Structures are given as structure tokens and as C-alpha cells.
Amino acid sequence: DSVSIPPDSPNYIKVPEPPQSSEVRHPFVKGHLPIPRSIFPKKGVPEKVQSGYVNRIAPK
């Protein structure tokens, strides 16, 4: 924050709203994104995160 918040912006004095004081309805976002694959198994600790895994497959 190199520039201080001036009194014009609404962030000058922050007064959080009490819980359950608004019912804004967010519109349904259309589209999807590609699900990033998983690199580790669902159970157990794999060998990829061990001591010298990188040094064993990518030696100097």
C-alpha cells in the first residue's frame, strides 16, 4: 500500500455488516474449467515426495 486510502473510497472506515443482513443472489456462472489431474494416489504416501526422488530421476 504505497498510496493511503483517501476518504473518497468506501474502505476508509470499515464497518463490517452483521451476520445474515443481505440476500444477494449471485447469477449462475456458465461454463466449466478442465479439472486438473491428480499427481499422487488417493491413499498412502507416494515415492515422489521422498528424500532423493528428484536426485534419482534427474541426476547431474
Binding site: 504505497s2 498510496v3 483517501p6 473510497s9 478442465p34 486438473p36 534427474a58
Partner: protein, 98 residues
């Protein structure tokens, strides 16, 4: 050949790019394997700042990007530069001093 490249999205005269992990020989805007981040070429300016400076907002998953670079992913000339500024790769081009 996996590649970390950009997918152009947006409207006419309003470019908006999407950093993705896709195979080389595929369409530019086809559904990739993952979406690492986004890139906006047009630089913006702080709301309540009058210095005149400009910045480029970039969202990047450095953790996910590093893994793909370690397995043989080939970032394009544009993404290589961005990764260099973050400090993952070395610059591909530099201003000649002489």
C-alpha cells in the same frame, strides 16, 4: 509435447489471455489439461494513485507451473518471459549493452 502457452480470449480490441498446459499440436482455444493462470496485456493504473505508474495484473499458480517445467514442459517465448520475471527460468533474451 506439453507446453505452457497462452489462449487468447476476450472481445475485439480487448485481449485477455489464459495460461494453460496443452499439447503442442492442438487448437489454441481447445480445452487444455489445466489452467495455470491468466494474463492481461493492457496495463492498468491504481485507482487513487496519480503518479502515472502502470502495472500488469497476472494470476499464476507458481507451484503447479514449476511441476510441469520439471517434467519437460516447453513454455512459449511469451510465457518464458513471465516465468523469468518470477524467477523460475533464465531470460531468453536480454538487451545488448554494447
Amino acid at each position: 509435447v506439453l507446453k505452457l502457452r497462452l489462449a487468447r480470449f476476450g472481445r475485439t480490441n480487448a485481449p485477455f489471455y489464459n495460461i494453460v498446459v496443452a499439447h503442442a499440436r492442438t487448437a489454441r482455444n481447445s480445452k487444455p489439461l489445466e489452467v495455470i493462470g491468466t494474463y492481461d496485456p493492457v496495463p492498468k493504473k491504481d485507482t487513487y494513485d496519480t503518479t502515472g505508474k502502470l502495472h500488469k495484473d497476472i494470476k499464476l499458480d507458481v507451484t503447479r507451473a514449476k511441476y510441469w517445467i520439471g517434467v519437460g514442459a516447453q513454455p512459449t517465448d511469451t510465457v518464458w518471459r513471465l516465468l523469468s520475471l518470477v524467477g523460475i527460468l533464465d531470460p531468453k533474451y536480454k538487451k545488448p549493452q554494447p
